[PDB]
Amino acid sequence: VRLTPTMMLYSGRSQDGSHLLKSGRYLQQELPVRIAHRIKGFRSLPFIIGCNPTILHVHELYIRAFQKLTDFPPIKDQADEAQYCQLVRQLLDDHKDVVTLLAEGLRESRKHIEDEKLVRYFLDKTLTSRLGFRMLATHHLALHEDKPDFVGIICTRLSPKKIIEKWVDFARRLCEHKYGNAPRVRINGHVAARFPFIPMPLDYILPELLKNAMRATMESHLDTPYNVPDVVITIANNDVDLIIRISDRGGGIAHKDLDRVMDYHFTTAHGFGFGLPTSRAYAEYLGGSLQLQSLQGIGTDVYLRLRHID
């Protein structure tokens, strides 16, 4: 019965599999309405934006998704549900490039309107409903599996340190490939903490912020790539939220860029311009936040806050 924003992830067990049917019907009740909501969003886009071929592509994908979902017969038995799972999987696969297509689509078309507020509002709303969609969908699929410490996509005892480490190794590799080195990362504060949590949003955000911190460190120690300052991560765990402070000595975000870094499409180039604003939208959708503190000339502290599960 664990819930986030007006939407619940179904926590429940049964040896026969009656939990699968109620979950499946929930998705069948929930998904279509929300795709429809996002189709209106496409219909309300400024005409010249909505006309861009890629914007239209994604537009069509969303209609197709609605069509397929509503055409599916109401679920009554395991064999129905099992086959609905096939459709959910197909949809996930089909829609995996959507963020990128949206980025490409809006890149040019966005300058052609005077209303700056509109695209931000559209992306925030589209991308966050989509996260909610992938969460709900991946959860249902995961409910089939019998993995240790997981009720669906909900880890019962998640380790912030362990997940940070997963993404550190990843980001370091990428950085080594581009620069020949990467900063070491140290992790302090509540390194021993374990609690119920959904990893998925951490899996988008963490690598984004790690990417940014590593780039900035390297791009400001171009004379000594072999010796760079560590990035330092602090985990704080309390009864209300989890806070992860990612703090670097990469020179800061310049005063001139400060007001634009949270803008979609804005970048100083790991070069697409979506890391910061997507991450923030995700965090706020989940009831937390993402806040920057620039120390121009020294570095940046990035604060990720996510609410605990009720």
Add this chain to the structure above:
Amino acid sequence: VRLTPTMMLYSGRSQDGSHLLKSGRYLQQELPVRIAHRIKGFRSLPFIIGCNPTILHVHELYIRAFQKLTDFPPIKDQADEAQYCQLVRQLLDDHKDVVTLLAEGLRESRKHIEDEKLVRYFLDKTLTSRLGFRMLATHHLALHEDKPDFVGIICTRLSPKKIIEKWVDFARRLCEHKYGNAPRVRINGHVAARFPFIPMPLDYILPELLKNAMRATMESHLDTPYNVPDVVITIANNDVDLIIRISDRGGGIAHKDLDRVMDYHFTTAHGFGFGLPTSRAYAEYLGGSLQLQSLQGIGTDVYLRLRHID
């Protein structure tokens, strides 16, 4: 000709002392108008607040100050100016307890109105005009002196590290007296920096924040007062501003208190409740800011930003 908020501190020299006369006339032109502005502020206070004996005391002090200032004859020669200096000194002495009297005065009387916004607005405005007053006045007096590296109260080559150190020693002493120990303080980033700057606002703010950070550290290591985590201060110096990050491992500001810590009179007790909101008002008056980042369960980062001199 160095200026801050619609007001200029006079930078100039002369062996005969013609710079003193123009400065004196400036003060004579400026102070009265601004005292008058603050008298209206007293006149507009909710009646039941304005009636409190201490509030009235300060009210009278401001009238007396206006009376004395406007009664002073226009300045024409050194001997005039010299005597105006005596009056400025007297006013400074007379008004030194004003913040405290205001705190005592408003403590009870403030609950008696429904408008929470009003007292904050009154204090911010009164206390910041007063800082501007003491700055202008102390500057003029200082212009008599011939100290190295000082044009008035404007240090020509101020060292952030050195001023932080001054206030560290101070705060540590206070903390040792109360707890039997204090955290060591380390200072990193641009420790070698020197630039023109006015120390005065740093002299109010720095000890306030150092006080808060030391208390929190001790009040959360009550089992090991002999061994506490360091407070760590980071100086960043760029072309736009000076940033001083004061960061502690004192457990954070709790979610419940977070919205109230910037309120005048609010405190969890070094016990008066004015440190944070006064400091922030001062910083914003000077064109910078003061921002908190709580890591509940771990500690707090406090970010002080002050603009450089034009």
